Design an enzyme around this catalytic site. Structure first.
Site, mmCIF file in Angstrom:
data_model
loop_
_atom_site.group_PDB
_atom_site.id
_atom_site.type_symbol
_atom_site.label_atom_id
_atom_site.label_comp_id
_atom_site.label_asym_id
_atom_site.label_seq_id
_atom_site.Cartn_x
_atom_site.Cartn_y
_atom_site.Cartn_z
ATOM 1 C CD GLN A 130 0.227 1.304 3.039
ATOM 2 O OE1 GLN A 130 0.015 2.366 2.454
ATOM 3 N NE2 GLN A 130 1.031 1.216 4.102
ATOM 4 N N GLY A 142 5.001 -2.745 5.613
ATOM 5 C CA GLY A 142 3.969 -3.333 6.435
ATOM 6 C C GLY A 142 3.348 -4.507 5.716
ATOM 7 C CG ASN A 145 4.236 9.358 -4.703
ATOM 8 O OD1 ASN A 145 5.084 8.630 -4.194
ATOM 9 N ND2 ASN A 145 3.063 9.598 -4.132
ATOM 10 C CD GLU A 157 22.391 -3.850 -23.558
ATOM 11 O OE1 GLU A 157 21.347 -3.777 -22.879
ATOM 12 O OE2 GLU A 157 22.504 -4.610 -24.540
HETATM 13 N N1 LIG Z 1 6.215 3.932 -1.231
HETATM 14 C C1 LIG Z 1 5.660 4.833 -0.424
HETATM 15 N N2 LIG Z 1 6.029 4.909 0.904
HETATM 16 C C2 LIG Z 1 5.466 5.817 1.733
HETATM 17 C C3 LIG Z 1 4.502 6.702 1.269
HETATM 18 N N3 LIG Z 1 4.153 7.473 2.348
HETATM 19 C C4 LIG Z 1 4.871 7.085 3.441
HETATM 20 N N4 LIG Z 1 5.691 6.047 3.062
HETATM 21 C C5 LIG Z 1 6.674 5.245 3.835
HETATM 22 O O1 LIG Z 1 6.522 3.880 3.461
HETATM 23 C C6 LIG Z 1 6.263 3.032 4.574
HETATM 24 C C7 LIG Z 1 5.064 2.135 4.275
HETATM 25 O O2 LIG Z 1 5.361 0.763 4.437
HETATM 26 P P1 LIG Z 1 4.261 -0.217 5.098
HETATM 27 O O3 LIG Z 1 3.559 0.528 6.205
HETATM 28 O O4 LIG Z 1 4.918 -1.452 5.651
HETATM 29 O O5 LIG Z 1 3.217 -0.559 3.914
HETATM 30 P P2 LIG Z 1 2.522 -1.997 3.660
HETATM 31 O O6 LIG Z 1 3.419 -3.184 3.944
HETATM 32 O O7 LIG Z 1 2.038 -2.054 2.234
HETATM 33 O O8 LIG Z 1 1.244 -2.089 4.638
HETATM 34 P P3 LIG Z 1 0.805 -0.969 5.705
HETATM 35 O O9 LIG Z 1 1.537 -1.230 7.004
HETATM 36 O O10 LIG Z 1 -0.667 -1.133 5.984
HETATM 37 O O11 LIG Z 1 1.050 0.413 5.123
HETATM 38 C C8 LIG Z 1 6.004 3.912 5.785
HETATM 39 O O12 LIG Z 1 6.787 3.461 6.874
HETATM 40 C C9 LIG Z 1 6.399 5.306 5.334
HETATM 41 O O13 LIG Z 1 7.531 5.683 6.077
HETATM 42 C C10 LIG Z 1 4.112 6.625 -0.088
HETATM 43 O O14 LIG Z 1 3.264 7.344 -0.619
HETATM 44 N N5 LIG Z 1 4.703 5.687 -0.912
#
Ligand SMILES: Nc1nc2c(ncn2[C@@H]2O[C@H](COP(=O)(O)OP(=O)(O)OP(=O)(O)O)[C@@H](O)[C@H]2O)c(=O)[nH]1
Ligand SMILES: Nc1nc2c(ncn2[C@@H]2O[C@H](COP(=O)(O)OP(=O)(O)OP(=O)(O)O)[C@@H](O)[C@H]2O)c(=O)[nH]1
Ligand SMILES: Nc1nc2c(ncn2[C@@H]2O[C@H](COP(=O)(O)OP(=O)(O)OP(=O)(O)O)[C@@H](O)[C@H]2O)c(=O)[nH]1
Lengths: 144, 438, 54, 427, 50, 41, 438
Positions: free
Chosen positions: G11, G144, G228, G254
């Site tokens: 996410q 997460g 982004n 390459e």
């Molecule tokens: N890629 C991305 N990372 C973000 C964004 N906003 C904040 N983050 C960072 O990316 C991390 C998100 O990772 P996770 O929380 O493990 O995401 P997930 O495993 O898909 O599942 P969730 O825990 O529900 O979000 C957070 O710790 C933020 O520090 C974003 O828009 N895109």
């Protein structure tokens, strides 16, 4: 407390030796500009190589160049190892200072409250309502 | 090609550079917008501006100077002015904290995290440059912020750039006027740190600048507008060789080769001869002879030094305007035959002449006269050791009674550095004395 | 293999839209100032009426 | 950026703080309601040194009012500018002082210093990076001395890296009303010089004399005296807020003023004092200014340094002036008066010019003096202290509070050291 | 004047001295060669005589 | 002397920089008659 | 042909791919409906979209990407967005249960029953593709759900298809900012699992991304929309070689061959030079030289590493826009001869250039500049080991006092390969210094 004054000057002199030896590094590793480098007769002066001519071995100026660079880099490591220790030791003395000072200050406000009740006035109930609160308890506990 | 970079350290050194850059646009066609009229001079940035301004394909002339300051008041105020759109935003290096007049505070406390940024500025200016003869350092000896920050950066630009020229200009401390008693402390600190790095240091004093104002310019109440204008004219003259041509053209490299006799001492004196009011120039006449006498008239110097109490070494003449070598070579010969003019017996010749045909121009809303024949009197004499003589018997007092030391030792110095400079000075006067002895 | 680069007409088209972009960026600030100060005015009136009730 | 948080201490500073702030508001043109009428861009841009931004263009004074007696609080709150001040900053106690220094220093302070420290640190975190602090109080004022000595002590270890400006008034030498006032001053000054870095010394009798000398209006109000000292205090603060080539920082000034740490006590000097006809009888020229600036009658602080010599002198010039007149005036006075400075330091002048005139007058200035004229001050209190400590009158209260003779011994011994300190340096 | 130049090792101004410490050897061989240039040059000269 | 008599400024809240350095007229500008004229590269 | 399949796990990794595909539709002029204008570019799906989109007979540009997430909120939100009609419904693989930041929960508990579903998508994507050079994996080390879920998949992706490239992109953990303390747990689990299977893993750090923005883009309050867009432009630039051509065309094969020197370490760093604000681009000019200085300027790197504390091995630059080889090869010649830039002497040359004629464009509602000469700087240096050096001392403390182990041992683990992870890590640093050791 007298020591606390003393180390600062040592730190002040210790730090100064460091700055110009970085400068001394720059003055022994070139000016880091190749495109101006030529104007100082690019190291190997044209005159030297045409002096070589018959050649037959060359100048040990590169040898001292390598040796001099090696030395200053060594001293760099020596001081940095010594420098890092100094701040750690200093803060410990700084921290130990705070504990000592606060210790007596909290300890100080003990005798005074006694004489506030020796006086011919004052009776039972004034003490007990104020026993639980004579100083805001909170012994300042490095509050921030 | 033939270009340079100007350095303006100290809020005192920024309004002067402001005026200088105002002056510079008054001959380069520059409009306050940043572009010419529809007339065709824009391009890849190659014309009279190419040595001074950077008018790229965007058509906006970018000055080749950086204004550095540590108090945002004036620099933000000039960031709201008339030419601020021309000035590059973060070339106007601003700051939030001062040095408390303390050279070391401006050299140790804050200069560490700022010089790296300005080092990025110079390299991005150095790379775009092609010939980059040297640097134009505008500072002040009694600098509240000019003193400390310059010393570190001039050191840093010396170590990475130790081959190109560095031109130093600072208002000399007033011999009898002291707006601050801490001024000598840092002033000698600046000198001893700079003697072994500075290339050509040029000094000036405002009092005799003002003395000129009500002597011949006849202004009892002038301003920095006038004060900034005249030094701007002075630096404009020395830079006219880059802008224009003449019978012969000279460069800063020739100046340093020919002006400084020996190492360490690099402290010559400038002077502009035709300093006169407009009406006085109106119903009178200008020629080489009288301006030669005026430029060698001892009271026309902005420096409190009696040439008859010293002895000459060099005299560099930069004639900007309509002149012929005949009267030039004739008049100087008469000057050589003058007996009051006392050069050292070591030098048979000491005359560096620069001829430029461009007639010096007036500034709109100005105060100067209408000049066709002008010359800058660049000279070095032994009558200057008194300037260092006056400050030592000044300084040796306060150091013995160690005034304000609690301030400096408070934020992290010791007395050894103060010690070093005094015999460094004691070396200076004896060197002045020894070279004075023939 | 022979493309010699863009023409200025594109560049003039280039420089212009940034001038636009700054302008809507400026109003984007200003409108948010309006949006923010509206909330306070709502907070002012509700608080005023609360004092009326008290 | 660098900013200042102010403290209103003692019941005198309660009037002083009220007058000092309204002067600033009228200077900056904010109405008493607080809704600034945008008229001057420069003051619009340099209000953040002292004021934060509230909602609707209201400029909150970043000052703290503290007292024990509510009536003074209510009076200043009911004043024309009580609304611009915050009830958040109105910290008060549930007790009457009796104006006992020790009660305010040991008894009542203990349960109020906690509250004020939280308030100031909240205000400290409300701002980014202070220059430091300034405090309006009195040295002979029971509540102000009692809390101030406490507060200045605590702030020292909290932030030993800022400006601890102090503004205190010396009580009338001839009469002190409070008979224990000499005790209060001796107690406070012990900690003051130990904690302080700057001290403004002001006396009321000279202010009455100045009313006699130039105001000529017979009966003024004490607020008018507050109007004067606020104007003097405003004048020195004009440097920081206003543009123009004058280097404004108090540290910039202090390092020019203090060759030795014990030099904390400083004497003011102000700008044209004008009588009923002389408003339109005056040719306002820097000479007649500079003449009036160095007048033995123009002083207001303690007494005539005619008895002593001049250690350090600094004057700030507010208005449309130039480097030449201030230079020659300095040359004139230096040649006029060379010997009565100390041979220890020549060129003892520090000059600053604020190009922005005040509102109502154009050519103005302000002077701060550090001369050998404090010897009369603490020697005077010495005989008073010794005479009362000769027979220990009115001492049972402080013993009742928890006081014994010992602390006085070093308090006067340190005082006696400063007497010899001030003398021996000049003499 | 105290004697100071012994060895230590820090040399803030070192490249420049070493640069002139090349100047003696670079000129040294030049002097010797011209001596040979002297004897060879005249040799052929009067040799062409006979 | 008569006009200056008023000595009453209208815009007292003026920085010297604004007063000292306003925008100068366009027609008062210097021409580069001979300032190293190199139209050719 | 020259196509690939994109994967968006986490996410965190779903809004970024949303933004990337938003960016990608602009340069092709994709209408949100899913069709071109009446202009004739649709067909059997063979034009600029053929490498990215699948605009089949239906005429709707179907992106070759799969969004996988474990919580329905954001994916149900985006499927209510603007381009949801473009996106294939069950390609937006949603979930109903989270991994609670736990790596193995997303690797064991729920991933088993959904991997078969997504394996259907890839093979149904695999069959429709023709060349399918590789894959685009967007994840996060502090995942997460991204961490654990992608771990099993890429393992399953490695075993079935080991004959093609796998490109990995994740936000690197913030060195001093930690929004989760199980993040060191799952991160080291990801790195060790990926070391022997990941082909090319690329990382970024947000703090310096913010630091750039208020440095040059001058925005004190950006957003993911800007964040982004930055990374979206980064992946757009590296994909421009697939989109358009240039003087030479370069491919990830390459890239792989010329970037990774040796086994394991396949972690270069990308960078984009012409990151400047609008008005700064207005009255200034862009050329190869200064962007070449800026690209190697250490503060322009989004990962907190000092190149002078490490040494360079490889550097790949992707010139998108109008450049000539003349100033290119000249500028890099200066760069190669630069003193400060410390390449390892093992590599005489380490420079891989990709020229693309197409100028980079802006996105409507964007904040970037309008670049005519752009470059993405792919480089690998030894200055990266401090990050893992930072990682281990965080982990060694935490693990010794075994915090949150009850959580992990609760649902089926214990501390075993938490150990192998650290000497797998301890292998990395020793390898990093050994290759650092010449
Ligand atoms: N890629 C991305 N990372 C973000 C964004 N906003 C904040 N983050 C960072 O990316 C991390 C998100 O990772 P996770 O929380 O493990 O995401 P997930 O495993 O898909 O599942 P969730 O825990 O529900 O979000 C957070 O710790 C933020 O520090 C974003 O828009 N895109
Ligand atoms: N260069 C210059 N100097 C001036 C001007 N006006 C007055 N001065 C003098 O130049 C000195 C400036 O030095 P400093 O005050 O230390 O300047 P600074 O180091 O940049 O820091 P500040 O104190 O904030 O100005 C003052 O002491 C004045 O005596 C001016 O217009 N230009
Ligand atoms: N506000 C105010 N204070 C005055 C006035 N006249 C003299 N003062 C003195 O200012 C001093 C300082 O006030 P505070 O420190 O607040 O008074 P305190 O601590 O309660 O102790 P006291 O001196 O007894 O009032 C007092 O000691 C008064 O003697 C006046 O007219 N107004």
């Amino acid at each position: 407390t007298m020591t606390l004054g003393l180390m600062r000057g040592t730190i002040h002199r210790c730090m100064k030796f460091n700055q110009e030896m970085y400068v001394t590094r720059g003055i022994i590793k070139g000016p880091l500009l190749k495109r101006n480098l030529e104007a100082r007769e690019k190291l190997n002066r044209p005159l030297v190589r045409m002096y070589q001519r018959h050649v037959g071995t060359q100048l040990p100026e590169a040898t001292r160049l390598a040796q001099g660079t090696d030395l200053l880099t060594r001293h760099n490591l020596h001081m940095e190892k010594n420098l890092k220790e100094l701040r750690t030791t200093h803060d410990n003395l700084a921290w130990g200072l705070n504990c000592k000072k606060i210790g007596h200050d909290v300890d100080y406000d003990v005798v005074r409250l006694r004489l506030r009740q020796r006086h011919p006035h004052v009776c039972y109930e004034q003490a007990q309502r104020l026993v639980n609160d004579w100083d805001p308890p909170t012994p300042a506990r490095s509050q921030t | 090609m033939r270009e340079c970079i100007s350095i303006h350290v100290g809020q005192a050194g920024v309004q002067i550079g402001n005026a200088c850059w105002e002056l510079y646009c008054l001959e380069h066609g520059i409009q306050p917008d940043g572009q010419m009229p529809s007339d065709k001079t824009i391009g890849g940035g190659d014309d009279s501006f190419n040595t001074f301004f950077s008018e790229t394909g965007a058509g906006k002339h970018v000055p080749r100077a950086v204004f550095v300051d540590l108090e945002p008041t004036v620099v933000d105020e000039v960031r709201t002015g008339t030419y601020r759109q021309l000035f590059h935003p973060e070339q106007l290096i601003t700051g939030k904290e001062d040095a408390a007049n303390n050279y070391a505070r401006g050299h140790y406390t804050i200069g560490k995290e700022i010089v790296d940024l300005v080092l990025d500025r110079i390299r991005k200016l150095a790379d775009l440059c092609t010939g980059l003869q040297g640097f134009l350092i505008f500072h002040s000896f009694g600098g509240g912020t000019g003193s400390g920050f310059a010393s570190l950066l001039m050191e840093r630009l010396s170590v990475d750039y130790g081959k190109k020229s560095k031109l130093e200009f600072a208002i000399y401390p007033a011999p009898q006027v002291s707006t601050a008693v801490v001024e000598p402390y840092n002033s000698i600190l600046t000198t001893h740190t700079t003697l072994e790095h500075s290339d050509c240091a040029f000094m000036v004093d405002n009092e005799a600048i003002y003395d000129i104002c009500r002597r011949n310019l006849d202004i009892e109440r002038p301003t920095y507008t006038n004060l900034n204008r005249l030094i701007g004219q002075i630096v404009s003259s020395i830079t006219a060789s880059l802008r224009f041509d003449g019978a012969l053209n000279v460069d800063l490299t020739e100046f340093q080769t020919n002006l400084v006799p020996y190492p360490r001492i690099h402290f010559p004196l400038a002077t502009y001869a035709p300093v006169i009011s407009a009406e006085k120039a109106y119903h009178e006449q200008l020629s080489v002879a009288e301006i030669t006498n005026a430029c060698f008239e001892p009271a026309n110097q902005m420096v409190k030094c009696d040439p008859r109490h010293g002895k000459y070494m060099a005299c560099c003449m930069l004639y900007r305007g309509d002149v012929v070598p005949k009267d030039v070579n004739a008049a100087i010969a008469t000057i050589k035959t003058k007996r009051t003019i006392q050069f050292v017996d070591w030098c048979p010749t000491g005359f560096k002449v620069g001829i430029n045909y461009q007639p010096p121009t007036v500034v709109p809303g100005g105060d100067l006269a209408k000049v066709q024949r002008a010359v800058c009197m660049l000279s070095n004499t032994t009558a200057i050791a008194e300037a260092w003589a006056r400050l030592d018997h000044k300084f040796d007092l306060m150091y013995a009674k160690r005034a304000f030391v609690h301030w400096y030792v408070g934020e992290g110095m010791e007395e050894g550095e103060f010690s070093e400079a005094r015999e460094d000075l004691a070396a200076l006067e004896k060197d002045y004395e020894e070279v004075g002895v023939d | 293999d022979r493309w010699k680069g863009m023409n200025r007409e594109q560049l003039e088209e280039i420089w212009f839209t940034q001038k636009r972009q700054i302008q809507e960026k400026l109003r984007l600030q200003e409108e948010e100032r309006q949006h923010s100060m509206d909330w306070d005015l709502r907070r002012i009136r509700k608080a005023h009426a609360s004092l009326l009730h008290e | 950026m660098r900013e200042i948080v102010h403290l209103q201490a003692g019941q005198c500073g309660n009037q002083i703080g009220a007058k000092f702030w309204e002067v600033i508001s009228d200077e900056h043109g904010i109405d008493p309601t607080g809704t600034y009428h945008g008229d001057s861009d420069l003051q619009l841009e340099r209000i953040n040194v002292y004021y934060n931004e509230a909602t609707g263009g209201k400029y909150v004074p970043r000052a703290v009012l503290v007292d024990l007696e509510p009536g003074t609080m209510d009076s200043v709150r009911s004043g024309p500018f009580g609304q611009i001040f915050r009830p958040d900053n109105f910290v008060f106690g549930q007790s009457g002082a009796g104006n006992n220094w020790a009660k305010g220093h040991y008894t009542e302070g203990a349960e109020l210093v906690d509250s004020v420290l939280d308030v100031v640190r909240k205000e400290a975190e409300s701002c980014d990076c202070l220059q430091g602090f300034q405090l309006t109080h009195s040295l002979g004022g029971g509540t102000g001395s009692g809390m101030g000595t406490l507060l200045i002590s605590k702030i020292r270890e909290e932030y030993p890296d800022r400006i601890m400006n102090t503004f205190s008034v010396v009580p009338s030498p001839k009469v002190s009303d409070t008979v224990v006032e000499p005790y209060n001053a001796t107690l406070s000054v012990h900690q003051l010089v130990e904690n302080t870095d700057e001290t403004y010394c002001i006396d009321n009798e000279a202010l009455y004399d100045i009313c006699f000398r130039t105001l000529k209006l017979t009966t003024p109000t004490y607020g008018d005296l507050n109007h004067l000292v606020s104007a003097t205090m405003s004048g020195v603060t004009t440097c920081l807020r206003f543009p123009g080539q004058l280097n404004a920082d108090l540290r910039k000034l202090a390092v020019n003023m203090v060759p030795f740490p014990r030099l904390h006590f400083f004497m003011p000097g102000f700008a044209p004092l004008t009588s009923r006809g002389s408003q339109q009888y005056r040719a306002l020229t820097v000479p007649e200014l500079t003449q009036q600036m160095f007048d033995a009658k123009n002083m207001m602080a303690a007494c005539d340094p005619r008895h002593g010599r001049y250690l350090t002198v600094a004057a700030v010039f507010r208005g449309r002036m130039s480097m030449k007149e201030v230079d020659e005036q300095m040359l004139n006075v230096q040649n006029k008066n060379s010997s009565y400075f100390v041979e220890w330091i020549p060129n003892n002048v520090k000059t600053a010019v604020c190009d922005i005139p005040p509102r109502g007058l154009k050519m103005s200035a302000t002077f701060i003096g550090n001369s050998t004229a404090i010897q009369e001050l603490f020697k005077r209190i010495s005989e008073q202290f010794t005479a009362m400590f000769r027979r220990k009158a009115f001492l049972h209260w402080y013993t009742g509070e928890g006081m014994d003779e010992m602390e006085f011994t070093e308090a006067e011994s340190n005082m006696n050291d400063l007497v010899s300190e001030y003398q021996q340096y000049q003499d | 004047k105290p004697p100071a130049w012994y060895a230590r090792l820090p040399l803030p101004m070192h490249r420049d001295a070493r640069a002139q410490q090349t100047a003696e050897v670079v000129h040294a061989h030049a002097r010797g060669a011209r001596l040979t240039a002297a004897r060879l040059g005249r040799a052929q000269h009067q040799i062409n005589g006979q | 002397l008569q006009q200056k008599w008023l000595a009453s400024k209208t815009s007292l809240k003026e920085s010297i920089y604004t007063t000292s350095y306003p925008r100068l007229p366009v027609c008062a500008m210097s021409r580069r008659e001979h300032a190293i004229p190199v139209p050719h590269p």
